[PDB]
């Protein structure tokens, strides 16, 4: 759905052999807390010997963007399973928030690679804080001085089905 970012912190269940375990943490892009906690265990099962029965969750917290109105350039590192095998990707996305970037990334991957949410892993999302570290021309194109461009061929949507004059595509 529309995504949100969640800080999820988890902990192997305490014992007498070892109380106070090491309190692992993850950032999860998800539409709600149930899916956030599901994915937390999905990944922590891949990294460590733990599962939802032998562990617990100490805190789940929503992370909002600190600057939701600055236009950021993000780099995203992705693992995705194709039909033949598994691959890695670096994609640059110019957007205003991490969640918007991740939405756009899932859509671009669904479109250009027929990869699904179950097939995609997010490794990290990182704000490129210096221009000229960008390396994708489709983002570098909008980083030009005093940029300006038109929108040719405007289409005005009609409330009616009959129009009594020929329309115009001026703008």
């Amino acid at each position: 759905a529309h995504f949100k970012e969640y800080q999820v912190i988890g902990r192997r269940l305490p014992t007498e052999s070892v109380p106070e375990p090491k309190l692992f943490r993850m950032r999860i892009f998800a539409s709600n807390e149930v899916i956030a906690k599901s994915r937390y265990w999905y990944f922590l099962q891949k990294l460590h010997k733990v599962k939802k029965a032998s562990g617990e969750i100490v805190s789940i917290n929503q992370i909002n963007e600190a600057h939701p109105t600055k236009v950021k350039n993000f780099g995203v590192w992705v693992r995705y399973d194709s039909r033949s095998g598994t691959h890695n990707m670096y994609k640059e996305i110019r957007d205003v928030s991490r969640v918007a970037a991740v939405e756009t990334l899932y859509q671009d991957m669904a479109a250009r690679h027929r990869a699904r949410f179950r097939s995609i892993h997010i490794l990290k999302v990182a704000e490129i804080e210096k221009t000229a570290d960008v390396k994708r021309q489709y983002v570098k194109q909008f980083l030009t001085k005093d940029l300006k461009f038109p929108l040719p061929h405007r289409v005005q949507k009609s409330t009616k089905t009959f129009s009594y004059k020929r329309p115009s595509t001026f703008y």
Partner: protein, 191 residues
Amino acid sequence: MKYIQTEQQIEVPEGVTVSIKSRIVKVVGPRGTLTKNLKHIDVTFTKVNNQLIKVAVHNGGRKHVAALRTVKSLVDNMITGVTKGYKYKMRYVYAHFPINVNIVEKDGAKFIEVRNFLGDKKIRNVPVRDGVTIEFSTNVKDEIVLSGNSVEDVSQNAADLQQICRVRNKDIRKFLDGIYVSHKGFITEDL
């Protein structure tokens, strides 16, 4: 990847005048006038300084952008052909049978007539396009010269005259007879 701006420049010499409404181009120069229709291309034109015209595509892909430099070349060739002109020299090639090339006027249409190609009794007729001028070159043996403003018309006339003289039912590696374009240039070379 949807380039948001791609431009190409068109330099305009001294005596030429370029008039571009919607996408109908008209070039007027010393050697005559030419006009073209580019309503199939979706580009925009912009006059800069009365000797420079920019051609732009906005939010275009690989093909839409590839057509921009094509437009640039087409208008450049109209200008080149109305200032200098275009001249295609063709040579006749034969081993045994002399090819007899003449010009005739059937109903005032100015056809080219090729006779005795490989002993053929067929008389092969190529129509001359309007805007093309034919000269059988003295100072060279068996050479014809097609000159005009429109490179399209000139080169298509040359291709017609070169393809009407194709050999059938033989090995063309041995039977090389024909009429072949030797040179493509201008009437005012190195002005």
